[PDB]
Symmetry: D2
Subunit: 181 residues, 4 copies
């Protein structure tokens, strides 16, 4: 079908793009930032808010003390209780959502480490501990683009893989207590 | 390149190939007319399947659809009690075994609503439902190494949405674009 | 203990003030607006978002087709699909949260009816369909106030009672269906 | 107007009952338990989940590290990461909602301290660190009852006030940081 083709092309295109963006040493660094962090936070709005919730679900099941926030007040009250043992991962596909960029800046002022995920090379000039570049959507118009989560989910999974192999014995045992009840 | 990076990327590409196989262009085209047809659309799911339900709500409301996503059983119960034949429920259960979802689809049918189930496991119990959409399985046998549980569903969501937007498009594109109108006080501008 | 007495005094004072604020005719009108509307929206942020969510829960069980939204994008996308048959209830205790005031102005431009709940009167609110005055708190310092939901819960409960007596038999049946032996998800 | 009086009587009745049920020493203890805890969890379903969400909002702004959980999957994954530095507050007005009773039991097994809030006493809550009795409602028919949050909000506000006075200076600094010139109010 012609519409079926557009969707599957958008999928393989961002697949094809994601291949070229992957910085494996950056991803293993982030996995280590998570392991070393005491408290970990995921910020995003809209569909990037859904990505942040997905991450909370998966890493909490490997034993991570974390929390997903998806609005401005939640960002403000949460950054006000961060310190140097915290890590914040911010998700913003455009790179331009002010609540996310401002909340990463607030977290940095409190000494937290910061990671921004975005499809737009940052203009902030290496302001955050890390900036993970994700695929851009192929479709030019917002209305026909595929799930905004997808560029982010790729890197979700990649970091998940690297993180699972740090201290896995302790993490597989936490994962499996769910089925064992 | 890395082995871990290697395992993740073939998980993605295998479900791209297995998805490619499972599509039924005409079933998804049908499911698209049911959303237009319904007056009230509900999306039900738990865990990661709830996140899929939340995303459908976000995308279809922006095309003008009256809809709501629910993600625990009490919301299923109270919501099904106000359904009628002009209601459509989409239920998401990758395992196909989550009782809260199967039971609330049975509940929705009782009220006369049309019903669609999304699952990686086929069955004959789902014959009760108006449609059953078959989605890709993951490939990692280890549940803990599987890639994100949303993905088999996001494919078919993207497919149905692609179809849905071409039904009565002018007015759906109007509603979508209003978020960027300069008059919209809570809009993107701000 | 004086702490204990201070908290309890806050609850008593709120209840006294609420009685002094009630306009029963207005509350009856608002009950009627809910019943007449085809779709009802509850808008709030922070503690006022929780108020909105509870109202959605209780009125859904009486058959109302309704939704609670608690952020700016939810407000914008929802107002863009409103019409003459919709009703928006906005909760802002301070009466000044811009997203809420703006969301009701956007709703009004789509033809929808609008109700603002606030503890701070204003002549700017003159533009909405109804303005419901709720109680202020009685602790001068914000950090010692009791829950910010409470002024609103009083009036939600008043509206609920008036509403339940409008075509009650049909609403009590929907509410009772949750306990029906046929109801699978139900307890 | 008989309606208006009924709703107001329900509020007054609950205030009067709440005062009779308060155990001031227990509340100070729970306030001290929250401070002493490293991580605090609030569990509730339905209206009791909104109560838990508001507790999270208010105690976080005083510097508490906490999270609210309002469904069964969330409870299990959270208990599987608890330990002795943890406190969980469980809200069940009926006292009989199984996901709440069970998961609090899981949490004690993990080493966590436990607090059930309920309006129905029971001897099989004697396994928890604390049981806070809250007020029942005063309407016979469930459909005519006031917000189900209210019995819990009374006691949450009591605990809040006790807690605010432990190390108040540092808590007021965190609370006020929301109004400092830093980004995102
Ligand atoms: C272009 C557009 O529609 N944006 C809306 C959402 O689709 C998006 O998910 C969210 C976060 O956007 P991000 O921060 O760029 O991810 O912002 C807006 O809600
Ligand atoms: C299936 C599983 O192992 N773990 C959780 C999620 O990953 C899952 O998405 C959801 C079940 O919903 P399902 O998709 O119908 O299975 O909740 C499960 O507890
Ligand atoms: C002063 C302050 O700290 N306000 C916060 C919340 O306590 C409040 O619930 C919300 C709603 O404000 P409202 O619109 O006046 O109800 O705004 C902020 O999130
Ligand atoms: C009797 C009834 O309708 N119960 C429903 C809710 O109103 C209640 O808020 C929740 C928690 O029950 P609780 O655990 O006793 O607080 O359970 C059910 O959703
Ligand atoms: Na695309
Ligand atoms: Na896979
Ligand atoms: Na007060
Ligand atoms: Na009552």
């Amino acid at each position: 079908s012609p519409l079926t083709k557009r969707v599957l092309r958008s999928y393989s295109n961002m697949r094809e793009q994601t291949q070229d963006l992957i910085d494996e040493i950056q991803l293993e660094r982030i996995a280590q930032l998570i392991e070393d962090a005491e408290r970990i936070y995921f910020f995003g709005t809209g569909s990037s808010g859904l990505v942040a919730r997905e991450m909370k679900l998966r890493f909490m099941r490997l034993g991570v003390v974390c929390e997903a926030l998806t609005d401005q007040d939640g960002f403000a009250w949460t950054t006000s209780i961060m310190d140097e043992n915290c890590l914040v991962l911010g998700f913003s596909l455009s790179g331009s959502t002010p609540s996310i960029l401002d909340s990463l800046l607030d977290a940095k002022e409190m000494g937290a480490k910061t990671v921004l995920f975005t499809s737009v090379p940052n203009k902030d000039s290496q302001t955050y501990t890390e900036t993970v570049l994700v695929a851009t959507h192929s479709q030019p118009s917002y209305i026909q683009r595929i799930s905004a989560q997808l560029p982010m989910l790729f890197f979700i999974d990649l970091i998940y893989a690297y993180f699972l192999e740090i201290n896995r014995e302790s993490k597989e045992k936490i994962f499996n207590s769910y089925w064992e009840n």
